[model samples]
Target: STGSATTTPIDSLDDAYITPVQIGTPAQTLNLDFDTGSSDLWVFSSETTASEVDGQTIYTPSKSTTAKLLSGATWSISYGDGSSSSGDVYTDTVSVGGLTVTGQAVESAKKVSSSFTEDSTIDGLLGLAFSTLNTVSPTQQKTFFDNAKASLDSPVFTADLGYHAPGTYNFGFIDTTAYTGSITYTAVSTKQGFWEWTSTGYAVGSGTFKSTSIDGIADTGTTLLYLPATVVSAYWAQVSGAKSSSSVGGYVFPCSATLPSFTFGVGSARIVIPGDYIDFGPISTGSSSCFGGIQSSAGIGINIFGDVALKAAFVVFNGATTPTLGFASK
Candidate 1:
């Protein structure tokens, strides 16, 4: 079976994309952060501390006849930024758009950090990463993709993230109409339980392509484009009035300054990002300085092709026995 769902950026700067997911037999719907960077399918629910609940929707398993507790199963996800969430697990009928996965592990959060509590728009996270990274102790649970892959005709899913707009996350099949040309395929390394691959090269707007094999991961959970310092420096050097700021953090420049486009190669395919998409947004309200969406991955340790880069192209996460990633210009 195949399905199509719209994933939309919550903030004007495209901080994170959210997709609607239905869980339980009664179909309790909640908008979820469809993250490809992690492997825990967790949610804010009745089990969560009431104090941590903001205006976000909560999943109540008791309302569903299909909900079944996975005894003694618990999960915890800790982020690099120190934010975390943890709780027991439950198996339920989970569906995204039209794709259904019965007995899908649904991690119900009993505790969550203040970072997540303050966000009213996000209800939880739906992990699309490999099941090998799942954190359920004693018995690792399969990711929704992993559980549903057997039912998928082609065992693939595609992400067509857009700039300041909603895009498609389709499973089981690739819609040729969603892309402009032929797709370039590359091998994926699942050793780290991520959609990790090597980018062939990159070029600043109208600049010559620099040949380099940069290891990176396609993370929908990350907000910006993070590359090696050399590649980041090359792109920002072409823009006037661009500088790294200590007070505001990272690279910020005049809002009016014209930015050059960015292009990164995947095999022989070149996906280009219009300069406007690189304008992450102003740092503060009504501020004249805007933060660049592309930054250095020196501190991150690995290059991350996040929403900033993903929004510029149609990406395919092929989950066959021999996994591969497909990139196409849109």
Candidate 2:
């Protein structure tokens, strides 16, 4: 979930990660990925010529009285992951949570990739992660947050992927129940979208991380944990009679014994990973083998900690509220 963090920091087109945003009116409901990496709020167009994207919901400007296409404007976006989509630019009355905004920037992609265009799942992405990360620009206008800020209850936005379950992402109005305290602040790094922090290693069962010993970054865009080889090796070493394995291809560890509760130390804070995350499931290839939560993405240089590890604590992106970016937990 971490990427380049330049161009107004949160406004860069490269740094933002995509999340689902709810679309449609009170009569209809649709959830789509809201990408801050690109500015346009495009969805699959109904007029798409390709049958590959059949059954997917396509936006029809003519059908919606709220739709407005910008004259002489076109939007196209390509991600670092070999995914791309392009379409005509239009504006619509988009709403998130219970709040509504008028003339929101949107994209209607005529061409989409197989992952997006064909494999029917959800509708499309919303791209609300950041502004500098926006892909479309004729005038470099305000992003969803900027325009919705005044109307939104709070200037802060929080993403909770745990409580809702898979393919469920929500924005607007930070859920206080998800965190223990009021909004706290951390400084934003001008270099990337990543929220950098120091970790103190991990703790399991009833204890805390030893000596507050690790430093790393928390990323929402990534799906798994990418730790240093040393950390990956050392953590698994804790497992009784642990043996190295690459079956799952993450940081796979093997031991029939029950896995311990691992806690990732972030600065003075300790975010604990529950035991359920460790004992994920019975290893398919090795019936006697079991895997722990920590996996290996050692070769991948950047330390990207995904939602699996992040769900342990509450994360707050504080560019809009505080001088330094803020992340606090319950």
Candidate 3:
């Protein structure tokens, strides 16, 4: 049977989509960010300091008879946006949708960074990256997807992230009705524990697509699209009032400025980010300045096709031999 679940964006952040997951016996529910960028399933729990817990829903393993502690096992993780969390490990029953996996390693957070502690909505992270990237020390852990794949009908999952709307994260099988047209497939390199692929090129507005190969990762945890500095500058240069804002930490433009669509090539498919999506709201409420959703991945060696890019298309994360990606217009 297909293990399917729908994820909805937090109206305030709109940066990440959260899905409900059940952990431990008697099933304690938690809203987890299904991140394709990293591999670690961690949740806020009794182990977390009360001061750090804030409004997050906590999972009490002591209440679950089936929970087992992995003595000496610990985990710590940091994200691209500076968010981080660390915790002890426990083996418990973890389920998503109708798919249940027993003895799954569930990291219970003992400490969380401000980025996580401040985000009252995010209780934890459900990593969808390769299992090889799991960070449990002494012995690496397997992600929920890895543990359940053996029983899946197709050993695959599709990400249907939407623009300021609810989306579905389907496992075991792909829903034909979720997307339109043919699915263009591209080879992926998982050497770095990511869904890394090379894009043939990119284009701005109606401009010609320059044949510049860009190596990047498809990351669901990231909120914006990141490219090389030169590429980002080139795209923003087309905008009349766009300027790199040090105070704002990225490119910014007047709120009324018109934006051009950004397109990235994936195999033969051209995934387009509409003009509206690039203008990532305003710098602040009633502010006349707005931030650009497309930014420079200057220090970060690899570019990132984050939520902004993924929401524009239906994505297939094929876990079969030689992991590949299939993209189609949503």
Better of 1 and 2 by lDDT: 1
Which runs of model 2 end up more than 4 angstroms from their true locations? 1-28, 34-42, 47-49, 117-119, 137-142, 163-175, 181-184, 193-218, 239-249, 253-257, 278-301, 321-330
lDDT per residue as tens, model 2, 1-330: 111111111111112233334443322344455442334466777656575486676666676777777776677777544678876777777666545667877677778877675535456665544555556656444566667766655565555445223322233455556667544444454344435555656665665446644445556544445666676676667667666665555544454576666666655555666655555444565566655456655555556556556555566554454424345555
Candidate 2, residue 32: the lDDT equals 57
Q: Candidate 1's residue-wise lDDT over 83-184, tens digit each?
A: 899999999999988999999999999999998998889999999889999999989999999999999999999999989899999999999999998989
| TM-score of every prediction relative to native | 0.98, 0.72, 0.98
The local distance difference test score of each candidate is: 0.91, 0.55, 0.90
Clashes of each: 0, 48, 0
Please estimate how well model 1 matches the true structure, expressed as its whole-model Cα lDDT.
0.91
Off by over 4 Å in 3: none
- Model 3: per-residue lDDT, tens digit, 69-171? 9999999898877778898999999888878989999999999988888878889999999988998999999888888888989878889997888998999
Sorted by TM-score (best first), the order is: 1, 3, 2
The most accurate candidate by TM-score is: 1
Worst 10 residues of 1 by lDDT: 74-83
Rank by lDDT, descending?
A: 1, 3, 2
- The reply for model 1, stretches above 4 Å from the true place, is none
Model 3's TM-score against the true structure? 0.98
